Amino acid sequence: SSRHGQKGVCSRKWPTIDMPFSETGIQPDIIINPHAFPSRMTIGMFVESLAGKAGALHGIAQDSTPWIFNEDDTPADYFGEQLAKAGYNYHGNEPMYSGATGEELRADIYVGVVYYQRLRHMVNDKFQVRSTGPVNSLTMQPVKGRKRHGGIRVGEMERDALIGHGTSFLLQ
């Protein structure tokens, strides 16, 4: 997760030679989708990308306690001129190539260093399987519980979905 509400599980550990690479030589260690932003409207993560990157170039920490910016002095104007004094652009974009084809991409890629968080919801605390195992004593049905090698429940709201498809041997 970020510090803005942008959670999400990991899909693949994508190898370095298959990742995009900039002109400065770096490669990102997190890819996040731009389609997570418009419905969520987290522009604090966009401006953390300008603030985080422009602080990494100068060796400074910019504060981010809220309402230190007005509508006159936008932080996109503030952290853009810090990136423009270092050689990077005012908008926080970098010209990146592809890792697979190696070609120049169309537009410059919006990058930066934001602060992520690792949540405690790993797969290993989830993730149960059962072929056979222990059963309950009076129903002779599988046991509730992941850590007792038990089964998942097919309740009433899943029973009638098997009715609704007309599949009568999946229900049995």
């Binding site: 400065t24 030589g25 770096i26 490669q27 990102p28 260690d29 985080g52 990157k53 990494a56 170039l57 100068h58 060796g59 400074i60 260093v113």
Partner: protein
């Protein structure tokens, strides 16, 4: 906890630059941007390692069960 060998985004060796960084901030009164440039950390992925390292192992090491206190 302790300084990361071999920074995460490119692979430049970074773990040999923590004690040189605290030297170049305390004795030689440099700011944090000049000291990262004197150590050869140019890319901003390499810069945010030594700049933002907490060095929390110095707080762990004060609990030594193998010594009287």
């Amino acid at each position: 906890m302790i300084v990361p060998v071999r920074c995460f985004s490119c692979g430049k060796v970074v773990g040999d630059k923590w004690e040189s960084y605290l030297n170049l901030l305390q004795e030689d009164e440099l700011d944090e941007g000049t000291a990262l440039s004197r150590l050869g950390l140019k890319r901003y992925c390499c810069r945010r390692m030594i700049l933002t390292h907490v060095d929390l192992i110095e707080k762990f090491l004060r609990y030594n069960p193998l010594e009287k206190r």
